[model samples]
Target chain A: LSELPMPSPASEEVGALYDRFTALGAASLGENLHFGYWDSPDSQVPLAEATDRLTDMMAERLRIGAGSRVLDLGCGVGTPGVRIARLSGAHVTGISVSHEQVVRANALAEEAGLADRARFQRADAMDLPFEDESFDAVIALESIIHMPDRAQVLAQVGRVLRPGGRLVLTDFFERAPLAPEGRAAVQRYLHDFMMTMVSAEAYPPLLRGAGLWLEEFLDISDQTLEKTFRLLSERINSSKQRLETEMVNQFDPGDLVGVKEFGYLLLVAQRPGK
Target chain B: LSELPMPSPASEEVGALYDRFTALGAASLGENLHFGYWDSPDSQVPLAEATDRLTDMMAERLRIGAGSRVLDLGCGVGTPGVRIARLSGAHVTGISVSHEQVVRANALAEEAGLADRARFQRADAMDLPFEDESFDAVIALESIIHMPDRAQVLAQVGRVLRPGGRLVLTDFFERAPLAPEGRAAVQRYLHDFMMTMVSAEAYPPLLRGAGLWLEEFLDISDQTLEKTFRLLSERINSSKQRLETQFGEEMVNQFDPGDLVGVKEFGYLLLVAQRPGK
Candidate 1:
């Protein structure tokens, strides 16, 4: 039904991609499976600090505290979700499509002494296995891109969120319509990562249609775009031979080179209520 | 004994004033003895709604949830404390300097079916009777103005708050140094009210001296100062005969004369602070 030449990647395929790549990525980037955020340009902060800073910013937007229940829609290996639990004493329920990620995520939380509060399981985002209005807040950090349908995934987010609950997420979009020369790079990027893109302008109406109000929409590409890709590129290039041996045929350092043109979007939306 | 002719009003005197004045106030202004807030100057929202709005804002700043333990310092009639408990499911322990107020406040919470969670008792802010690190958050709505020492009361707040816990409170100040023309009005205002004022600039260092960090200090006089005065003045003027009969002209006449004093310099301060820790 999607009007495209290629069918959207199935959740299973996306899950497989992460199941295979997460370990190699974690070996280099630790447990965080997301991009980083630098507070300013030309600030040569370390990768962990940048990534944790982004995580803290996301947690702040949720406005949750002790005994609050939060759902992490695309929780990666559970790093950010555990951090949120430790930071505010909020109970976090994190889900990933990848079984391997779920196991690793739960292990990470257990090691962090937050097993009582932070939990992770395998579930599809398009069809969340939770009750209606079950969560006080929902956070999706770069996880929705792997979903086949943004509108359907967001409807689930709205349904699970309690009235007045907030949703903070990161998304990706092309700055403008891709030119012919950029097609191969975009194609390789999508093919390698198993993700999709949405237009920046489409988010407001998309959220409204799904019964959520867009409170804030920011293009943090300046802080995250080039800075993240360059850092990742350096890591991949430096570890090319080791990663090639680790990932076999799936490894390619050049897949991320020209993808810096993509814009990163940070959104804060709320369900209407008290 | 002090340099000035007037000494700060004692807690017992202030408590008696509220015990005497609260019933009359509730009869006219409902249980919310606090002032209202108009997002804009010309907006005419009702009093209960405005007071509740301010209460909601203070609750939001505390960032609490169901398991949070909150101390409502200087809780007047337990209205705001009950509201906070109901809204967030947080356990609220409200304390008041007035014994009569504590009794009425408990009755209010009991009637509201929140007595299990929101309790009221007689206690002083400057000398809190709680253990250290007892509360996750502290809220004082327009009550710190009645305390004798701002710094000491805040130190008590910091001592009771858990690490990383927040304190939200309101205080009063003069917009500037008073002129000779403003002396009589200011004097009557203080004498009749049994309250004290702090300088706007004095709050930051005062909070620091108490080992609490100031996160927010807002000048909300535009929304609360003159508007609350005019409303109270109108209520007082309208109920003059009945109030005089009830308080026997001794109290009503003292309140009536000070309503229109030099109010241009009257200010309301809202401060949010946090105890240092994880």
Candidate 2:
């Protein structure tokens, strides 16, 4: 339907290899090396600190602990799994849609020597590999927004957790119901990037539909955007070369620019006990 | 001044013991226990994911790398510290107020054979042992609330972090200015407990006062209350025997009912920031 260039599967495979090779090269050069290119430490330190504060605030709200067996859905590379496993000593299983991330997580577990306690598996968060009542706690850190049917993901988390098990997650939520223009902007952002995005209002009702009780909802959208802009500014200053190099390797400069203009968010929600 | 029995130093020490014992026991039982509780797994999962998502999030947010030195403030037993070090291949130093926690964290480091890359120390978050701008990043996961003077703690974090260094911390905050009744209730709750309790609302302006730009603030109060109630309900169901035995032995059933009532929080705040370059 679009005028974009098409490639054969072989060509696509070759392109993927080339992109990986260039990414590795840029990584070696310390350019666009991590998944968050726009967030520099200067920019991210605050966000990280804020996230930590949110964790505590939410910890009090969510009641995380060793008694809870947490399932991290859409867990990218199991970073949070390791922390939760360490913090609460709760048995944590992290699942990701990315095979590369799964493999990387396994390597990380062995390297950290947490393999005996924590595990990483390749699976979809929407349709988890776990059984009903399999976990006492379930969480999806900023991962559910990518799913087309986030309500299904919430329902899936509800099904997999014990009747009284807890679920904690954070993702993007629009500040207010987006007007047509805002919707268009958000839709454009998602469409251009080939990713899914959801609104704040969409979540509470969806969570309710999924059998999760709406505990707390705060519109920290202003803060998130401010942080994102600050992060982008720092990235521009400290790692422009790195980002540009990666963009040159993996995407057209135009595409990279478009993705950078999208907004950011942090949302938290939970599943209720019967 | 009031008729309430003041907690003696001995009783305070006993309370600490009780807290630790309870925490360890809970850990053994597979609860993801911590200082505060939340109802939702949304943000909780993200915080947990931050360890692995650090690379992606950092890449997306900060562009962090191998050489970046990170400081884990109030690093309880060094779990997050060790994990962060392993994930980022960064030098990580975890500081905690508890000697016991430090010892345990160090043991974990040794067991993981990450002693060289990760270090744990018994130090106050309010007065860290490091020099100025010593770290590229500083994080306090649900630990800053213990400090009565949160501003001083933020200042210390700002001091230890390099120019443009980031500070990520998770702690509780009140949703709105506590009404007089709410304040009294909070104070009453603190009176029942032996530890110092501070309001969670004092953080936003506190970070601003510490000379760090307040980049993000998330009010996760609803999820927090839900989780707290859930855990409390679970505890009531699962730990009846332990509670009865402990209460009977200690002759301190005075606060049990109050604790049950106060388990659900009024609100919470999560703050993110960066140290301003001179």
Candidate 3:
């Protein structure tokens, strides 16, 4: 892991990032808008089953229960929140910086018949508005990468969690020093994705600074590396016209170069018990 | 909530239950194959958004999150599973007794690129294959009303959850008794629908008998009543002759949306419970 964080886009650009998702959503099947997870020993679980495996894996790490009060940071359309409520019987409060997402998330809550247990509001993850000891658990899936600051967000998470509450999250990291070609490829990928990441090595100290106790961590770059390239290639090739229409550059198709210098990291950490 | 459970359909009719959903699915937008919920002050949410709202609200009551590994019981074409993985970031493994539903659900997951996070398979919810304490959460949306043995299923739920794991679910119930004329229509509706129910008053002790602890419950009968009649009318108007042709005139005579088979204000009950020993 690198010691420093990657460069982050300006806050105003978050809207543009969401616009990118809208385009992508219309172009693809609207089931899951995020990257698929396929890392378990039983990879033969079929493509769709394996895709859900990744999300389920993260939830298992969180140890969510029926009475858990969860804070969903960056909830998109509220799908994950919907799943958790059905699965764990937890009450979920979601926040998304995107206005459309907030609206969509709320609609989905009603769609799931969970109005009493699920709520959504448009709010910045960096500045959560709630009393201390407000949540039993906190989760940030791929959304954390889009934020401008990791430490500031983690600090907020620390403040929001009740004693012994856990924060389960995932992010990408620069796994190794990139050669010039790979570095530039990654920069372009980040430019299009409109996201940034912290050094996995440096994240622990930041969590410590935020008063969160590190409980578990893992690096799974190889798990998703090849699959990501395949998906991106499909996007870069078939959606070339689509990308160019939106004034976004089409990265090199069949390119595994971008992922060569990075890894995806999963982390589970907890607030100190009272 | 009634003192005793509603009369249940025969177990032999489970196949018919699956068949009814097929007709119902096609009659509607074929989008979501389930009931809708309305709690938002803004009723102006676009029609499609309103549909997804029902699913989202149910998920909310279930308290789904990315950190939750959830089982979507009786998942229909995996719409709820897909929603679960995307909104809550939870990994969902869904199951349906219907083989077609399992296949459709898997294809949907592939189409959505959520293949890794949401999965489906054919299995009897009453008899699952996993070990004891397998899932963090379990939910049986409206599907429970169709199962013949609710108590047996609830006991199974108690076994599947880890210590402190929660089971959140929703079911329909009778709010008040019906008139003789309406009772017959409702009886016919329940027959074709292949469904039954437990009184809200009846569920707490049963949940306790299943070795689970009740955490929360609610009755949202008024919230969905009118909108339901509206959707049913759309189906009845467009499919009056069609429904007549399939099931004949006797069925049509009684299938009136306004009449609602003695159920004007049906119960939408949400129950959240936990496995003890947490």
Q: Interface-residue RMSD per candidate? A: 17.3, 9.3, 21.1
**What TM-score would candidate 3 get against the native?**
0.46
| Model 3 lDDT per residue over B63-134, tens place | 557777788888887777788888888888888877667777898889988998998987776787778887
Q: Can you write out model 3's per-residue Cα lDDT over A118-182, one digit (the tens) per residue?
A: 88888888899978889988988777888888888899999999987888888776554556655
DockQ of each: 0.01, 0.03, 0.01
lDDT of 2 by residue, B101-196 (tens): 677778778888889988998666656788888888877765664554567878888888888777776654433334444455445434444424
Q: How many angstroms is residue A112 displaced in model 1 relative to the true structure, after the best TM-score fit?
A: 50
**Model 3, stretches more than 4 Å misplaced?**
A1-274, B1-7, B10-12, B19-24, B27-29, B40-42, B179-181, B239-258, B261-265
Q: Against the true structure, candidate 2 has what lDDT?
A: 0.54
* TM-score of chain A, all candidates: 0.89, 0.69, 0.85
Lowest lDDT 10-residue stretch of candidate 3 chain B: B248-257
Candidates 1 and 2 compared by TM-score, better number: 1
Q: How well does candidate 3 score on lDDT at residue A213?
A: 53
Give the true-contact fraction for every prediction, in order.
Answer: 0.00, 0.03, 0.00
For every model shown, what is its TM-score relative to the native structure?
0.51, 0.43, 0.46
